């Protein structure tokens, strides 16, 4: 009982805790698997703003020339 | 492609010499409206197929 105080965390700790660490771990694992799933799609088809190659130009010239 | 017919080009043309036309630039002042109509047709529609009339 003396060893339980100021030397031990207790059974309440690491049961309420660790599950909190697992809750962050579950979020870290699912989003990393989602990142592997998103990059597998975004690289194959140019749909989103990920792995997009730069284009030539947006605007260059529109004025009237001396063309035929 | 579909081009214009054989009888689309206007008769009586190029009777004047090359420098004979260049001698008088009064053609820019008198008879200027039909020249400007063809000019405005060309910048709007780039094809010669539509602006021939």
From Swiss-Prot, chain A:
So which residues are the signal peptide here? none
Q: Where is the protein found, in the record's own terms?
A: Mitochondrion inner membrane
Top-rank taxon, per record: Eukaryota
* Function as written in the Swiss-Prot or TrEMBL entry: Accessory subunit of the mitochondrial membrane respiratory chain NADH dehydrogenase (Complex I), that is believed not to be involved in catalysis. Complex I functions in the transfer of electrons from NADH to the respiratory chain. The immediate electron acceptor for the enzyme is believed to be ubiquinone.
Which family is it part of? Belongs to the complex I NDUFB5 subunit family.
Q: How does it assemble?
A: Complex I is composed of 45 different subunits.
Protein name, UniProt field: NADH dehydrogenase [ubiquinone] 1 beta subcomplex subunit 5, mitochondrial
From Swiss-Prot, chain B:
User: Got any disulfides in this one, which pairs?
Assistant: 41-51
**Subunit note:** Complex I is composed of 45 different subunits.
Q: What domain notes does the record hold?
A: Contains four C-X9-C motifs that are predicted to form a helix-coil-helix structure, permitting the formation of intramolecular disulfide bonds.
Query: Which intervals hold domain CHCH?
Result: 28-53
Functional note: Accessory subunit of the mitochondrial membrane respiratory chain NADH dehydrogenase (Complex I), that is believed not to be involved in catalysis. Complex I functions in the transfer of electrons from NADH to the respiratory chain. The immediate electron acceptor for the enzyme is believed to be ubiquinone.
UniProt lists the family membership as follows: Belongs to the complex I NDUFA8 subunit family.
**Which span of the entire protein is present here?**
6 to 58 of 172
Q: Where is this motif: Cx9C motif 1?
A: 31-41
Localization per Swiss-Prot or TrEMBL: Mitochondrion inner membrane; Mitochondrion intermembrane space; Mitochondrion
Instruction: Output this protein's name.
Output: NADH dehydrogenase [ubiquinone] 1 alpha subcomplex subunit 8
